[PDB]
Amino acid sequence: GTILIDLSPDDKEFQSVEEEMQSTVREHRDGGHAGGIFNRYNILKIQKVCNKKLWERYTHRRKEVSEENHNHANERMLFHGSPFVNAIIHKGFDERHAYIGGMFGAGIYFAENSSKSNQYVYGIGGGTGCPVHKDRSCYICHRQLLFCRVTLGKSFLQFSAMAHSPPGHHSVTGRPSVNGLALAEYVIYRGEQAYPEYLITYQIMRPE
Ligand SMILES: COC(=O)c1ccc(-c2nc3ccccc3c(=O)[nH]2)cc1
Numbered sequence: 001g002t003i004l005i006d007l008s009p010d011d012k013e014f015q016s017v018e019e020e021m022q023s024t025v026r027e028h029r030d031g032g033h034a035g036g037i038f039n040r041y042n043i044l045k046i047q048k049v050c051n052k053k054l055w056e057r058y059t060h061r062r063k064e065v066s067e068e069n070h071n072h073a074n075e076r077m078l079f080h081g082s083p084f085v086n087a088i089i090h091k092g093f094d095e096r097h098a099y100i101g102g103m104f105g106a107g108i109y110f111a112e113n114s115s116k117s118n119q120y121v122y123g124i125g126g127g128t129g130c131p132v133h134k135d136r137s138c139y140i141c142h143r144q145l146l147f148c149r150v151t152l153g154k155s156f157l158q159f160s161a162m163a164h165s166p167p168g169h170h171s172v173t174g175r176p177s178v179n180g181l182a183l184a185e186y187v188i189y190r191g192e193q194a195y196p197e198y199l200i201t202y203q204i205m206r207p208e
């Protein structure tokens with residue numbers, strides 16, 4: 001029951017999603033190995049993801065979290081990149097979208113930096129890059145990210161360079177403790193704590 005509504009580039013909603021995408025690009029310590037070398041994107045399309053059942057699944061869990069945390073869902077908008085973006089927008093997040101080997105355990109990972117999620121578009125560590133050219137830095141092939149509504153609730157703060165949340169918590173925050181420019185990354189351990197609200201289709205752009 002998923003439908004995708006195209007946003008117009010003239011729509012304020014397109015513009016504010018694009019701005020979060022572009023303004024949260026940063027350099028990565030791999031020099032571009034996983035995600036490619038770029039400072040910015042060419043945004044090709046932004047679609048709103050509409051699925052009543054998945055939305056209601058999300059809001060149900062959100063109310064549960066909120067009631068366990070002084071009526072505060074601690075809701076954020078966060079990026080997710082995955083080879084499984086098409087399964088996600090149709091069937092929702094679940095345990096098959098978890099990063100089993102992630103540093104905060106087997107859960108579903110999200111980033112404030114769009115460029116961090118870009119590193120997973122073609123798999124962990126960028127996999128073998130784009131299907132057509134086997135290039136992790138492909139400037140031709142169309143990529144997709146999700147910009148998601150995520151319920152964090154009471155988040156366990158991990159300072160740092162499916163499983164369950166830590167007891168008494170609804171999520172984990174990976175707080176960057178070395179790279180002064182990196183934004184936070186977050187993990188949830190229940191697929192119902194995220195809704196894939198925008199599907200963004202883009203290319204990374206070769207620096208001039
Ligand atoms: C089951 O699919 C995967 O193995 C997988 C692994 C990692 C990711 C992913 N891992 C992140 C880690 C930190 C910050 C952001 C992300 C993200 O957007 N995707 C997505 C899918």
Ligand SMILES: [Zn+2]
Nearest residue numbers: 130133138141
């Ligand atoms: Zn390619």
